[PDB]
Nucleic acid binder design. Structure first.
Length: 118
RNA sequence: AAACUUGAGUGCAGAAGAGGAAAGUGGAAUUCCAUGUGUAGCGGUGAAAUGCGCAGAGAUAUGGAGGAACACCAGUGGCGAA
């Protein structure tokens, strides 16, 4: 029931709509996750830096209960809550060994959706 | 009718180019499908809802299938009659 993973990876997906934080082992197996939506943030509040922090703190705390002490951070997306999430991991007591940006970029690939005229 | 070389061509020696046609080879990303981890949302908006998910979604890891387009370079840069 209790795992013992000392070293793990924290994945922060920050979008204009939401922030999701999943903490995984180095092999990509998930330990815990939290989101602005999961904590009951709604609408504009979901994308706020505060909501991102609270999501990060919740996910970190649960992961530490599995014995995680050190984390490597991977960030994806352009949302406002990326930095707050990274600070929250440190605040939760996990140590951030490395921070890396993994947001996907095509080398001129698929056609994007139409621009919103309104 | 007879000359001439300046126009227009030819030769010779150089120069650059997303000019065109046909094969072949890549890497990024999207979608789908398959499994592992995992959990109560995800997604979306001015705000919502429809939708998707709890028959395990989204996320994360790995593998496979397929199509389309070629980041950076890249510039009143280049090439072409358009």
């Amino acid at each position: 029931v209790k795992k013992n993973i000392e070293n793990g990876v924290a994945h922060i997906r920050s979008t204009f709509n939401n922030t999701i934080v999943t903490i995984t082992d180095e092999f990509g197996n998930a330990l815990s996750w939290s989101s602005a939506g999961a904590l009951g943030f709604k609408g504009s509040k979901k994308s706020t830096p505060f909501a991102a922090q609270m999501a990060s703190e919740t996910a970190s705390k649960s992961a530490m209960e599995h014995g995680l002490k050190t984390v490597e951070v991977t960030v994806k997306g352009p949302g406002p809550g990326r930095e707050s999430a990274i600070r929250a991991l440190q605040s939760a007591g996990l140590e951030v060994t490395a921070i890396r940006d993994v947001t996907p970029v095509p080398h001129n690939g698929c056609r994007p959706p139409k621009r919103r005229r309104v």
